[PDB]
Amino acid sequence: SVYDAAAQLTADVKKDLRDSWKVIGSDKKGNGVALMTTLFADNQETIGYFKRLGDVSQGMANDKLRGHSITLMYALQNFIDQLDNPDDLVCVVEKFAVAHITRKISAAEFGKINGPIKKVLASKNFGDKYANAWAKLVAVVQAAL
Amino acid sequence: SVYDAAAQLTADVKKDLRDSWKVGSDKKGNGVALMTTLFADNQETIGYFKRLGDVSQGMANDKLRGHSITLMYALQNFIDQLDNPDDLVCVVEKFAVAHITRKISAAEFGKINGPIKKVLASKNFGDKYANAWAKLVAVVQAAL
Ligand code: HEM
Ligand code: HEM
């Protein structure tokens, strides 16, 4: 249940999400492409889903990948801004869930983003504590897939 | 090209876009207002949004609300990329594709200018501001 998952976002979890987002969300282009390139490097089997972006190995040089990455960061911004209201958080999460369901992305494969997030966070000196906080937010989307 | 349309956004236009967007402060409210106004003045567009269900339900419609909030973040995206044409262009093309796939022409996309003008007016931002936003919408139209 996406609603029970949303209930898992307690005061402490929300604070950690906001605190870490202040840092990694300051450079959407840089960290966005970082997340994607890490995903493709650690989970090569997912590259096939991104046909439209072309040669993703080009990283920042790929205009389509850069546009995709920046936009992805605004989806996370959206989630963070909706933390105060689970009813709004849920309806935006379901909007993005549909975007992935049509792409044939399961909850299991969507969860493959946890590795990249943990690595990107770790590079900014944010440990497991924060990685786990983000895993709970990702869990809300997974509940809708 | 899209780059030409983006590169021709002047300092004064960007200033008006940012100042008016500052007042982007209520994405849920203004996002839904934008959509409901589009449906009220251009009833012929309702058919394109069948995935959202009964859009006459307004704020109560969770799908419409989710769509509206997300639409405002697309605009947030554009506004944040104003000073770097290369980045603005790649995000604009990303969203252009989303509309090209739905068969939305450049002319049809321009129908949003009416609703934007009205929403701006509700906050007392006049024609100068509506004109500035029409120029930003024109950047997207250059990709359609
Ligand atoms: C933090 C988690 C993630 C977020 C917030 C997210 C967000 C997004 C957004 C905003 C889009 C664009 C929606 C559209 O325009 O249709 C997108 C597209 C996509 N996402 Fe994700 N995503 C995430 C993780 C993943 C993962 C892990 C996979 C795959 C294993 C995945 C696969 C896709 C695919 C295939 C597309 C389509 C790209 C294209 O063809 O343009 N996403 N995602
Ligand atoms: C300021 C102008 C506009 C912006 C920024 C905008 C933004 C968006 C965004 C972010 C989406 C979701 C993309 C996706 O996830 O695939 C969307 C969907 C859509 N847009 Fe727009 N749009 C604008 C104007 C229009 C206009 C004027 C029309 C039609 C006359 C239109 C028709 C559509 C349709 C049919 C969808 C698909 C809705 C669905 O089935 O979920 N858009 N738009």
Curated annotation (Swiss-Prot), chain A:
InterPro entries: Globin, Globin-like_OT, Globin-like_sf, Globin/Proto, Mb-like_M. The keyword Heme applies. Residues 8-145 form the Globin domain. One of its GO terms (cellular component) is cytoplasm. Keywords: Cytoplasm, Heme, Iron, Metal-binding, Oxygen transport, Transport. Heme b binds at H100. GO terms for molecular function: heme binding; identical protein binding; metal ion binding; oxygen binding; oxygen carrier activity. Its main location: cytoplasm. It is found in: Cytoplasm. It holds the Pfam family Globin. SUPFAM superfamilies: Globin-like (SSF46458). It comes from Anadara inaequivalvis (Inequivalve ark). Homodimer. Belongs to the globin family. Gene3D superfamilies: Globins. The keyword Ion transport does not apply. This is Globin-1. CDD domains: Mb-like (cd01040). It comes from the Eukaryota.
